[PDB]
């Protein structure tokens, strides 16, 4: 009988994918991991969080992204084996013994992600990378059981790829670097579902120039323009999708909503059942992995639905605004120190109209290795050396610095206040005055 | 002075990026307000295709984006109709653009009464999404009603009447509900786009080129016949390759029995354990308001299932597990229920013999039970037909002039499946007369079909 | 150490960008050499669809790209066959991957014997592209043969025997030529993409997931039967909407009559004027070599037609003009030839009466061709069912021949419209037109 | 009786187009122009010439491109009349009396193109723009006959649009600007037929924001990103398709094949007949319009087949290389001045091995090609893509877009030296020379040894 390490499905298994057409699975191990409890739960977590409030097609899950990353990784490995094996190139070639570990790492790279990560980790101080390593290395998970079946040291080896400690730079960089399968998948996938496919670079063009070398992953010099296209697409996706103000307006609401809920919990004079059982360990700031694994997007929205009926005015309102899509509006400003006086003033105005500025205002800027080209020579050149102005795009700030406030403040008995407030806003830009 | 709400328009066009239609365009203030209402926003949290995502993992699109999609096709039809086929030039065969807003509201609101996994939900809880859509449109408690009523007191009732097909204008009615309406057209294109399948093989533009109004509703110029043919082909292929997929239905049967078991537990006066499913209580009790209904979505169900995995009922706990961990029931086809009856009874006996309660671990269903109707025209029934208009203005129905459409309508079929646990099909060192049962069971499955006990 | 030609792998996979398949992938030195060969490169200068481009102006794709496409589909099949259905796993019902190079060569070379405007050319000149394909593969004068002979001395004949369907492996024969083969799958996909008539797009990847070898040839998994239906449906839409188009056929008739007129002029000792058509001379005479035939492509003919516009024969000059300027004969539908015969004979008199020679300005035409289902579906147990047994009405559709009987005649016959005065000559046009109602012959005496 | 100007078809005619789905024709003038001998002639002329040797799908004709330019133009005119008429906007609006002239000019812009026109203009000193103006304004032409029926001055009016002298900038910039229907169709059409994803931007998004104003055509600010992506596609098609060294290797052969033929014809000492009668007026330098109108791609290849057996080793060999696809290889260098002696020496070695350097080598720039980079000049209105803000003011694209400024920033040409593949290799006595030659070729570039 065959070692588990080597168990090849007699018939290749395909999964239909809108982005890649088909995900192809050859190994029993990979199939088992796809079917595991903690990978399956990623079906219930949105890849893009609050972006579906701006781009309504952005309803894709982390599960389909994980499969897509594995699929791109697989395609890289095939090409490396066909064209750049150690057999042909030696030390600069690819060793296909590394395939299985590389594919598991690729598939499992995001397993530690929970619902609305950025916001959740801000409020509950979780870390999805450490939880990923915990999922891979803990005997309680189905993932660990599957990995342990490969060999005793295999769960830790797979974790070491994710932590970038694995001693093979080709494997580490396939999983994690500037142009990796992770990034290429979500650029393509986020573009496909949002409909903002300015993030169409051509994936096959990149797959034809990617190669291994003794120091990691490089790109043939003849495909420099393919690399440029990727840099450009990534730029376009950050600018048009990830940095979108309306998405972040919804994200600010969510952030304040979870925070208000936690404050209500922690406080002992608040004698009311939040009915938020699964969130309790996170309100207390003391949770297990099992408890973390029970959370998904629907858990949050169920709880928020219950909260619209809560005796707290702020919680009830913030829950409502999240579910009914009522984002905070924002104005742009470029200097935090110089805008401090103006922002404080306006915050007094917002308060005078009866919004508590702590939960109805925010200051926000986001939702928050080289690229080696290889000459026929064998020698390396960094992209910026051949293409500096495009390299400049990748390194830019793109900091979209903003002040958030209720739409109500714009155009009861304080109408003169709303006209006073809106006087400090011209074309979505904060005007600095007394 | 102030413009009537009915006539009010946005200062500039509002555009919603849509992966299927590129853009959704909004110009009327009424339409914007309706998109923003609580009852419509709710549809973001309900999946268009329910359990299909377990087979086609891209299929995570919502009812909200499908509703905007239908509104958008409708908008596109009205525009073509007004520019090319108005009453200003055709009279009783033309399109009166007074009807635009009512048609647009109806299109946007057509699926507003859908809940989570509505087909299953309606089977277990006896709800009716058509009744509830009309209830949402016509009840003062809802934001939809407040908006519609603000257009005119009689407007809610009129919008509702379009959806019940009682509205007196056949062009308006058929645009929203016929054999080739904005609704079917969107979900075929969009379901194909997200599943990643080709099967929405049809060109909306080649159909929007030939669509026209007439006295009795909506028709298609004869020179566009082949474009209508492709619509039918897409329809058929989406049905037989996606909507009717045995693995998706395997997951739907788990769901159905999961909710049925919860209901049976709650209403059994001697089961005492807290199901912690407060929002489902009104539905277990079979006594619910509109408000209680509007609080339901896919994530409410999913959250309750997570809790139920730990509930001390063995069946409930297990079925919650199977749904969340993706453990579909397997199935085999049969033909005649009456001929298959003794075989099915015997197989249920072997299933029970290994610890599975066959009431919850087996099922029988047909593709015909699903809300997907094949095109079958009837000379006596006008709303069953797709009409083509010859260049002389004469109408002929599609199948009579298309051998291909006649051939697909002719091979319209519902299958019949028997569901059972996969564990019934499985090398062990010793064979207990209990391990014998699985081996016995397998000899009844051949080429995916039951072998009759004969 | 030294590697046999048959085994010579490219160290790096060569890819050719293709709008239909995205990429054409080449592993073998033999395949690359065949692609670069003179007689395959010559297919760049032969339109896949001939006169269809007069109706669908995007249909300018060459036979070259179709050949690479058939080759690419075939190797995708071979890869799936090796991965999933090898002899190693399934024995007698499996794929032997030693058959790959020959299957690949046959796929690439299947259409090499096609010349310009194939249907018309073969009607007038009596050439046979299948026999010429076999000639090209097995004649030492071609670069194709020189290449295959290097694989092994018996290799050219083996490759030819695949095309002639005499090769003893049915899986190989049917991959190349049967009802659902790489050949048909490519041209339906390619012709859809270039015409923009994308009704004839079934899903290739779905078919590739159900296709399967067995001892007796090629079959399709039972759970994939709806994918087979899709292909049947696409092929039907393409035949009805593109291949049988009345207007492309209109141009085809002109071309047929133009070539026939030229041949006749050359044949006639009375006509002493030089046609300037040196590459057609062996074909006027009915006595040609392979070498002479390989010089022919679409450009050769259009160049000659340009010259012929100035030749002192008014039928040749005018027909050449009609072909280059796009002046197709118009047509009317009729049903059975026997009831319509007397009316058609009368209309040819009227046509002759106004100055058009009906031998050249009329035709009876019912296809692009100038004057039953066999698909096995496999059950899980390995038994076979023919497609018509599980899907009869879709099967009927495939076996149905779209008989579109038409009578072609000059547009001028109904071109007239409204005249200020009619004379007993303008009377002929008006009398002619009364026999045509909404694109159909009216059967009067 | 309807004036010809206004004659509509009883029923709109549609032309299936794989790029735009449908080409729509409503005016009788336009249909008549489509059917004219001079437009039908574009069916037999390839849009991309030698690119098909690299991207074998690129077999599309100039005729299909011209219909596409017409269809985009039509879409813009519809949008302008519907949303931005003079009736509502005044001097910043569109006058729909200009529709017919705009449509005729869009359809006719490329009518003067002959086969492989860049190479042909180099060898025979043709000018396709002058010939376009000649076809439009010469009575012997069907095009002219059709236009002359419209109104008295209409032919010369139409030609004046093409030469950009027409006094309506909205009309001129729709046909010819940095973002005209012409560029938009060929980027889309070329990407579609080559099978490259790069030149696919969203036409629909651009048409949503396109706008007339007093000084021509502008694009609403809220649509900047769609304009950005047009530039991205444009850049991507230049560097990856139009500037491809393998297609260019084939162009160099073609250039030299025609050159050798002209040379053979001029020389009275060369007896043999090239039997290429339609090229004779061009060989001699003296040709008429009708003679030009007879030429197409098929004519050239027909002659090359004949030339394969003409008793001139160079001409026969080069005809063979073109017909059989034997492109020259190439290497980059920086500037002609610094690289001068290396080229001289390489030519010596190429000669030593028995290739006449004059016909088997060549120097080439991508700049010499009919593809201009976006290079906006603040003084030169023409060079600019304008974006309209809410207040009505204009701002040039590169000004508001770092992405566009980045691409315009590294919008550089190249330099290549061509040579036979034979110079880079089992039994040769010239093996010493091949070895030396390729020592000057490192990383696909000329090594300045000498
Ligand atoms: N209003 C609204 N926009 C949506 C929805 N789903 C997606 N979107 C898209 C379309 C909008 O252009 C974009 C921004 O959303 P909003 O309309 O809330 O932001 P905006 O700053 O445009 O507010 P405004 O109404 O213009 O004051 O998000 C929805 O449910 N409602
Ligand atoms: N196994 C599995 N299949 C998935 C998943 N998501 C989508 N699919 C698709 C891929 C296949 O087209 C289809 C197969 O479903 P299953 O593997 O559960 O059933 P199948 O009968 O193919 O395998 P079985 O014989 O039950 O082991 O569902 C997933 O998470 N796991
Ligand atoms: N007229 C014309 N049609 C073309 C051309 N290229 C493609 N087509 C397409 C569009 C037409 O609808 C289709 C049929 O061509 P025709 O206009 O020659 O024939 P049809 O019988 O439709 O029109 P007719 O009754 O002769 O005015 O061919 C072209 O260069 N000229
Ligand atoms: N060899 C060849 N390539 C073609 C053909 N049609 C398109 N191509 C494409 C495929 C390649 O991506 C590209 C380059 O072809 P070549 O083989 O002439 O240049 P390459 O750089 O591979 O040089 P080499 O193979 O070393 O002579 O042209 C063809 O008929 N033959
Ligand atoms: N909620 C969101 N809103 C907008 N953009 C998002 C959101 N979530 C993710 N993205 C974008 C930005 C991320 O770079 C990318 C997904 O990467 P992810 O698996 O979340 O790792 P990450 O949170 O560490 O990214 P980053 O380091 O850029 O903050 O998609
Ligand atoms: N000139 C044409 N006009 C219309 N249709 C064509 C033309 N040429 C080919 N086709 C259609 C008919 C064929 O079924 C298909 C391609 O097959 P192909 O081998 O290139 O031609 P063919 O001469 O073998 O015709 P057939 O496949 O019917 O025997 O496309
Ligand atoms: Ca990731
Ligand atoms: Ca619907
Ligand atoms: Ca073929
Ligand atoms: Ca042009």
Are C180 and C220 contacting, i.e. CB atoms less than 8 angstroms apart?
A: yes
Task: Report which DSSP code applies to D3.
Answer: -
Q: Is the distance from the beta carbon of residue C414 to the nearest atom of ligand 3 less than 6 Å?
A: no
What is residue D409's three-state secondary structure? helix
Beta strands D441-442 and D445-446 are antiparallel
Query: How many residues belong to chain B?
Result: 454
* Ligand 5 neighbour A110 (Cβ under 6 A): yes
Question: Best interface-test mutation with C: which of A17, A208, A226 has the largest number of C CBs within 10 A?
Answer: A208
Sequence-separated (6 or more) residues with CB below 8 Å from residue D386: D213, D216, D217, D218, D219, D394, D395, D396, D397
Report phi then psi at D187, rounded to 5: -55, -50
Q: What CA–CA distance (Å, rounded) separates A219 from A177? A: 13
The answer to whether the beta carbons of residues D132 and D109 sit under 8 Å apart is yes
Q: Which chains border C (3 or more CB–CB pairs < 8 Å)? A: A, B, D
Task: State the CATH number of the domain containing residue A217.
Answer: 1.10.3210.10
Q: Which two tokens stand for residue A286?
A: 């003391």
Residue D384, min C-alpha distance to chain B (Å): 26
Residue closest to A219 by CA, chosen among A381, A98, A362: A381
Q: Are strands C406-409 and C330-333 parallel, antiparallel or unpaired?
A: antiparallel
DSSP string of A210-228? EEEETTEEEEEGGGHHHHH
Q: What are C404's two structure tokens?
A: 């579109």
Find the discontinuities in chain C where C to next N exceeds 2.5 angstroms and give the residue preceding each: 371
Domain identity same for D372 and D308: no
Please report, in range form, the residues annotated as the binding site of D for Zn(2+). Answer: 65, 109-110, 182
CA–CA distance, C256 with C124 (Å, rounded to integer): 7
At A7, list the tokens. Answer: 């168990």
Count Cβ atoms within 10 A of the Cβ of residue A63 and give its class: 0-12 exposed, 13-18 middle, 19 or more buried. buried
Render C297-339 in DSSP notation, one character per residue: -HHHHHHHHHHHTTSS-HHHHHHHHHHHHT-PPEEEE-S-HHH
Technique that determined the structure: X-ray
- Closest protein CA for atom 27 of ligand 4: D421
B144 and B255 housed in the same domain? no
Distances (CA, A) of D73 to A183, C336, D100: 39, 47, 11
HSE-CB of B213 using CA atoms within 13 angstroms: 29
Please check whether residue D17 touches C, CB under 8 A: yes
Within a 13 Å sphere around the CA of C187, how many CA atoms are in the beta-carbon half? Answer: 19
Q: CA–CA separation, B147 vs B156, rounded Å?
A: 9
Angle at which helices C246-267 and C314-325 cross, to 10°: 150
Extract the tokens encoding C200: 């004839």
Count CB neighbours of D382 within 10 A: 15
**What contacts B16, CB < 8 A, 6 or more positions away?**
A56, B23, B24, B26, B68
Q: Which residues pair with A13 in a beta bridge?
A: A25
* Distance from the alpha carbon of residue A252 to the mean position of ligand 1, in angstroms: 16
Q: Is C373 on the interface with B (CB under 8 A)?
A: no
Domain span at residue A356?
Answer: 244-366+399-434
Verify that A394 and A404 share a domain, yes or no: no
Quick one: C316 and C445 in the same domain? yes
Burial class (CB in 10 A: 0-12, 13-18, 19+), C437: exposed
Number of domains forming the structure of chain A: 2
Residues in chain D: 450
Q: Which residue has the tokens 């390995």?
A: C382
Contact of C23 with chain A, judged by CB distance below 8 Å, is answered with: yes
Please list the residues that pair with C213 across neighbouring strands: C218
Alpha carbon distance D255, D261 (integer Å):
10
Q: What angle do CA B421, B423, B425 make, to 5 degrees?
A: 100
CA distance A327 to A343: 19
Question: In terms of Cα–Cα distance, which of A194, A236, A392, A52 is closest to D225?
Answer: A236
Residue D431 falls in which region: left (phi positive, over 0), alpha (psi -120 to 50) or beta: alpha
SS3 D33: helix
DSSP 8-state assignment for residue B241: I
Binding site for Ca(2+): which residues of A? 65, 109-110, 182
Q: For residue D394, give the 3-state DSSP assignment.
A: strand
User: Going by C-beta distance under 8 Å and a sequence separation of 6 or more, which residues neighbour residue B194?
Assistant: A18, B49, B56, B58, B59, B60, B61
Cβ-based neighbours of C263, under 8 Å, separated by 6 or more: C124, C125, C283, C284
- Contact (CB, 8 A) for C316 and C414: no
With beta carbons less than 8 A apart as the criterion, state whether C354 and C425 touch. yes
d(CA D167, CA D161): 8
Q: Do A333 and A386 sit in the same domain of this protein?
A: no
Give A28's Cβ-side CA count (13 Å radius): 12
**To which residue do tokens 């603040």 refer?**
D378
Question: Does residue B36 have its Cβ closer than 6 Å to ligand 1?
Answer: yes
Q: Which two tokens stand for residue B254?
A: 């788990």
- Chain B residues in contact with A247 by the CB 8 A cut-off are none
The token duo for A204 is: 């096959």
Beta-carbon neighbours within 5 Å of ion ligand 8: B 111, 183
Count of C-beta atoms within a 10 Å radius of residue C239:
18
User: Which residues of chain B make contact with A60, given a CB cutoff of 8 A?
Assistant: 58, 60
Inter-chain residue contact B205 with D22, CB threshold 8 Å: yes
B398 token code pair: 């599609």
Query: Of A40, A30, A27, A163, nearest to A107 (Cα)?
Result: A30
Q: Measured at the alpha carbon of residue A325, what is the angle toward residues A322 and A328, in degrees to the nearest 5?
A: 80
Using the mean position of ligand 6's atoms as its centre, give its distance from the Cα of residue D257 in Å.
35
* Same domain? A217 vs A162: yes
Q: How far apart are CA B108 and CA B87, in angstroms?
A: 25
Q: How far apart are CA D303 and CA B340, in angstroms?
A: 76
Looking up tokens 């369907």, which residue turns up? C165
Q: How far is A340 from chain B, CA to nearest CA, in Å? A: 34
Residues D344 and D290 in one domain: yes
CA distance B249 to D20: 40
The β-bridge relationship of strands C9-18 and C22-28 is antiparallel
Q: What is the CATH number of the domain that holds D432?
A: 1.20.1250.30
- Tally DSSP H helices, then E strands, for chain B: 23, 11
d(Cα A134, Cα A111) in Å, to the nearest integer? 10
Tell me the C-alpha distance between C315 and C185, whole Å.
41
CA distance C421 to C423: 7
**Residue B36: partners with Cβ closer than 8 Å, 6 or more residues away:** A325
Copy the structure tokens of residue A351: 């308060």
Q: Exposed/middle/buried for D237, CB within 10 Å: 0-12, 13-18, 19+? A: buried
Instruction: Please work out, in degrees rounded to the nearest 5, the angle formed at the alpha carbon of residue B76 by the alpha carbons of B70 and B81.
Output: 125
Q: Could you tell me how many residues make up chain C?
A: 445
Spell out the long-range contacts of A174-178 with Cβ–Cβ below 8 A and sequence spacing 24 or more: A174/A73, A174/A76, A174/A77, A174/A102, A174/A106, A174/A217, A175/A73, A175/A102, A175/A105, A175/A106, A175/A109, A176/A109, A177/A216, A177/A217, A177/A369, A178/A369, A178/A370, A178/A371, A178/A394
φ, ψ of residue C281 in degrees (nearest 5): -55, -45
Using an 8 Å CB-CB cutoff, list chain C residues near B229.
199, 237
Residue spans of beta strands (DSSP E) within C211-313: 211-214, 217-221
A283-287 long-range CB contacts below 8 Å, 24 or more apart?
A285/A124, A285/A125
In terms of DSSP H, where are the helices of A84-127? 86-89, 99-108, 117-124
Contacts of D22 in chain B (CB under 8 A): 205, 209
How far apart, in whole angstroms, are the C-alpha atoms of residue D448 and residue C15? 33
Element (H, E) at B366: strand B363-366
Q: How far apart are CA D392 and CA D89, in angstroms?
A: 12
DSSP per-residue codes, D203-261: HHHHHHHEEEETTEEEEEGGGHHHHHHHHHHHHHHIIIIIT-HHHHHHHHHHHHHHHHH
Contacts of D207 in chain B (CB under 8 A): none
- Do the beta carbons of residue C350 and residue C356 sit within 8 Å? no
Residue A379 makes CB contacts below 8 A (sequence gap 6+) with none
β-strands A372-374, A216-220: how paired?
parallel
* CA atoms of D186 and D172, how far apart (whole Å): 18
Nearest CB partner across the interface for B407, out of C379, C383, C394: C394
Residues A310 and A424 in one domain: yes
Annotated binding site of A for Zn(2+): 65, 109-110, 182
Strands D386-388 and D216-220: parallel
Tell me how far apart the alpha carbons of residues B442 and B445 are, in angstroms, rounded to a whole number: 5
Closest CA to B230 of B171, B283, B188, B293: B188
Measured CA to CA in angstroms, residue A302 lies from A50, A262, A320, A323, A327 at distances of: 16, 16, 12, 10, 19
8 Å CB contact between B284 and B124: no
Any residues with CB less than 8 A from the CB of D80 and at least 6 apart, and which?
A: D94, D96, D170, D212
Task: Choose the mutation target among A228, A377, A385, A386 for the interface with D, i.e. most D CBs under 10 Å.
Answer: A228
Give the integer Cα–Cα distance in Å for D72 and A78: 43
**Is the CB of residue C111 less than 8 Å from the CB of residue C69?**
no
Q: Is the CB of D35 under 6 A from ligand 3?
A: yes
Tell whether C335 and C394 lie within a shared domain.
Answer: no
In a shared domain, residues C312 and C443 = yes
Same domain as B358, residue B376? no
Buried b (16+ CB within 10 A) or exposed e, D80-91: bbeebebeebee
A 10 A CB-CB count for B166 gives 11
The experimental resolution of this structure, in angstroms, equals 2.4
Chains near A, with 3+ CB pairs < 8 A?
B, C, D
Helix axes B182-195, B225-238, angle to 10 degrees: 60
Residues A176 and A264 grouped into a single domain:
no
Round to whole Å and give the CA distance between A48 and C297.
Answer: 56
Number of C-beta neighbours around residue B414 at 10 A: 13
Q: Phi and psi dihedrals of A216, rounded to 5?
A: 140, -125
Please calculate the CA angle B169-B174-B176 and round it to the nearest 5 degrees. Answer: 110
């Amino acid at each position: 009988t065959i070692p588990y390490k080597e168990q090849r499905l007699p018939i290749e298994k395909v999964f239909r994918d809108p982005v890649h057409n088909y995900i192809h699975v050859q190994h029993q191990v990979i199939l088992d991991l796809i079917n595991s409890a903690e990978v399956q739960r990623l079906r219930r977590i949105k890849q893009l969080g609050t972006s579906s409030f701006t781009f309504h097609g952005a309803e894709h899950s982390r599960f389909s992204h994980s499969l897509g990353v594995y699929e791109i990784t697989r395609r890289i490995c095939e090409i490396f084996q066909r064209n750049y094996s150690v057999e042909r190139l030696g030390e600069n070639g690819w060793n296909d013994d590394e395939r299985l570990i590389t594919l598991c790492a690729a598939l499992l790279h995001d397993v530690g992600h929970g619902p609305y990560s950025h916001t959740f980790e801000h409020i509950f101080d979780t870390n999805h990378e450490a939880i990923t390593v915990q999922i891979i290395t803990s005997p309680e998970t189905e993932v660990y059981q599957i990995l342990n079946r490969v060999s005793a040291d295999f769960p830790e080896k797979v974790a070491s790829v994710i932590t970038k400690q694995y001693p093979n730079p080709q494997v580490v960089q396939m999983i994690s670097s500037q142009i990796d399968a992770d990034r290429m998948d979500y650029l393509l996938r986020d573009a496909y579902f949002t409909g903002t496919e300015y993030g169409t670079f051509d994936l096959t063009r990149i797959l034809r120039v990617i190669r291994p070398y003794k120091g990691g992953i490089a790109f043939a010099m003849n495909g420099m323009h393919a690399v440029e296209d990727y840099i450009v697409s990534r730029y376009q996706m950050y600018v048009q999708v990830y940095f979108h103000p309306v998405s972040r307006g919804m994200e600010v609401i969510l952030d304040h909503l979870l925070h208000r809920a936690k404050e209500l919990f922690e406080n002992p004079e608040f004698d009311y059942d939040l009915q938020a059982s699964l969130l309790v360990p996170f309100f207390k700031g003391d949770f297990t992995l099992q408890e973390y694994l029970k959370l998904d997007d629907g858990v949050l929205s169920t709880y928020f639905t219950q909260w619209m009926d809560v005796p707290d005015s702020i919680l009830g309102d913030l829950a409502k605004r999240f579910l009914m899509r009522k984002p905070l509006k924002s104005a742009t400003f470029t200097n935090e120190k110089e805008s401090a006086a103006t922002i404080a003033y306006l915050r007094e105005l917002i308060e005078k109209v009866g919004f508590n500025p702590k939960y109805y205002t925010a200051i926000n800027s986001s939702y928050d290795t080289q690229i080696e080209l290889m000459q026929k020579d064998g020698s390396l050149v960094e992209l910026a050396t051949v293409s500096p102005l495009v390299a400049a795009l990748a390194g830019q700030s793109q900091g979209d610095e903003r002040f958030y406030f209720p739409k109500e403040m714009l155009d009861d008995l304080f109408d003169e206040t709303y006209r006073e407030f809106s006087s400090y806003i011209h074309n979505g830009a904060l005007v600095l005055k007394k």
